[PDB]
């Protein structure tokens, strides 16, 4: 029973991972073949860079401005910067923009979203002056609409690139996200790879590795069938016609529980998917963005993401129906997520109730083996030995995502981490009950000594990985090369 369940769990996980690896490799080969035919100095499609953010760090904002300015392309129509807040303390980033670009803040009287005239020419007079935006704080979603209107007024603009205020762009990042959409008329949206520059914290490095694995596996598998989810965000491109025709539905929608400043991206991706147009993802473009370094902040972000996914899963299935002979993989993955969550919860409950040493050791060894296989594949793909630290991601995943998902499902004097504390107390009580019930020493039994040896080996491996990670931080080997110059420049202020 338990052994059969563990075996089927392991074989299903291995098969799905192998299939996703094959799909990602096929997509990468197709993209490489497409790139091999790219002519030199290709500037067929114009780019309109739109930058939005709120409470951006001055150093991070300056670095992002330098990175987008350092981008090399044949022709750029303009750069659009939209700032969510217009308070006195919010003028710092506007003045920073005046240090890098022209002083064209031109504070609008009111946000254009609820304005009677939804035309960008009301607040903009010249298209070549790189106008800035200082709107009142009314939500991050409203900020993107103003930039979209500003980009849409120019008939010469054929596509736009969406980048966050904190993200860091490369020299060829802009070209790599606009080339794929031009070759195929069906393809209209391109997603760029996102990376985390800072990895000093154990949580930050695990989050970075998880993001890298997700982008290189799930995004590639989705792009093979051209059903990419969450295409938008940092380092993201959109064709002008689709965004022009779907701007109104994306902004006129209402929600019951909305954050003060969240920003909706899954809804935009789903709205793009309604038209049936195909979306591809490329890993060649590289973007660098920060990640939270606090456990509570990471838990809150995961809860918000889970709530958004649960809200949007209703409309996610409808998009797959529109596509002919396509989207079945997306629907299967969407069902697989909830099936996997329910099955892992049931397995955890069963192993906690039974409190059998043989079953727990077997399942923990299977989990360690599959995690080691995944880490080895990530190291082989990334050509870096730092991917072997992904084994410790299981602990933080189990301790954060599951309470976050439970809280998100329940939602749909903080009273946000209460469910997390209840889950921690429950798992601690289950562990105490398991260790108390199985309190004996019988070295004669082969099964008991085998379980003890296995658990001791697992603990030794975990301790060794923790020790090598800890000494790596002092050696500073685990520090990413990009963040070294960042902290050096911050020190040399």
């Amino acid at each position: 029973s338990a052994v059969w369940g563990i075996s089927v769990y392991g074989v299903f996980v291995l098969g799905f991972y192998i299939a996703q690896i094959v799909f990602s490799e096929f997509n990468r080969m197709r993209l490489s073949d497409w790139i091999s035919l790219r002519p030199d100095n290709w500037n067929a499609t114009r780019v309109a860079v739109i930058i939005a953010g709120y409470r951006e760090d001055p150093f991070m904002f300056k670095k992002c401005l330098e990175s987008v300015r350092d981008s090399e392309y044949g022709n750029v129509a303009r750069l659009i910067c939209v700032i969510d807040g217009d308070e006195e303390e919010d003028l710092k980033m506007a003045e920073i923009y005046k240090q890098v670009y022209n002083d064209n803040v031109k504070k609008p009287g009111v946000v254009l979203c609820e304005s009677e005239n939804k035309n960008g020419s009301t607040i903009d007079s010249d298209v070549s002056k790189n106008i800035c935006i200082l709107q009142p704080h009314r939500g991050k979603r409203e900020s993107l609409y103003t930039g979209f209107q500003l980009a849409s007024m120019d008939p010469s603009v054929h596509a736009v690139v969406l980048i966050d205020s904190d993200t860091v762009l490369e020299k060829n990042a802009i070209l790599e996200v606009v080339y794929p959409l031009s070759c195929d008329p069906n393809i209209k949206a391109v997603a760029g790879e996102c990376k985390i520059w800072n990895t000093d914290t154990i949580l930050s490095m695990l989050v970075s590795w998880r993001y890298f694995s997700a982008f290189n596996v799930e995004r590639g598998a989705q792009s093979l069938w051209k059903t990419v989810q969450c295409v938008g965000g940092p380092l993201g491109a959109y064709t002008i016609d689709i965004i022009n025709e779907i701007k109104d539905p994306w902004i006129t929608q209402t929600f019951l529980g909305n954050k003060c400043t969240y920003g909706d991206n899954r809804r935009l991706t789903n709205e793009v998917l309604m038209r049936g147009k195909k979306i591809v993802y490329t890993p060649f473009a590289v973007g660098w963005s920060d990640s939270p370094t606090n456990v509570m902040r990471y838990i809150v972000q995961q809860t918000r993401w889970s709530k958004s996914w649960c809200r949007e899963i209703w409309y996610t299935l409808g998009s797959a129906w529109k596509h002919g002979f396509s989207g079945i993989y997306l629907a299967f993955e969407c069902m697989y997520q909830i099936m996997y969550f329910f099955l892992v919860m049931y397995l955890f409950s069963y192993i906690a109730i039974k409190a059998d040493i043989r079953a727990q050791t077997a399942t923990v060894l299977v989990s360690t083996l599959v995690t080691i296989i995944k880490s080895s594949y990530l190291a082989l793909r990334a050509k870096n030995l730092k991917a072997f630290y992904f084994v410790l991601y299981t602990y933080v995943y189990f301790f954060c995502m599951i309470p976050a998902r439970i809280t998100a499902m329940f939602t749909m004097w903080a009273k946000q981490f209460l469910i997390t504390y209840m889950w921690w107390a429950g798992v601690l009580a289950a562990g105490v009950y398991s260790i108390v019930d199985n309190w004996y020493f019988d070295w004669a039994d082969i099964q008991y000594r085998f379980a003890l040896v296995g658990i001791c080996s697992y603990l030794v491996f975990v301790s060794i990985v923790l020790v090598i990670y800890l000494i790596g931080k002092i050696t500073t080997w685990n520090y990413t090369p990009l963040q070294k110059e960042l902290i050096e420049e911050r020190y040399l202020h």
Partner: nanobody
Amino acid sequence: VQLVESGGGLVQAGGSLRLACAASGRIFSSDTLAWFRRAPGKEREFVAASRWSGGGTDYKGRFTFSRDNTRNTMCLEMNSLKPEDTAVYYCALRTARDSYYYTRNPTGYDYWGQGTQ
């Protein structure tokens, strides 16, 4: 971003002269460098330019544009010089903060180097 260049001297019909324009600072990979045939005192005209990222602009084929892309300096070489062609050069630079379009107007250019023959 201050730009200084050295070179010039005797001019010959079959002779060739090489000019290099050194600048201090960061090009930002979006600034176009342009040369001018004569000083703006009476008459000035465009001869050649090329964006730092890539591409090139002439007027020809007698002017060659080379970018080191390592020590933030560039070199310009000319062949089959004419008596009316030789004059002072400025190797001016244009910032991309205002606009990304090819203005081609010397008025738009802000960074001006020292005029050396």
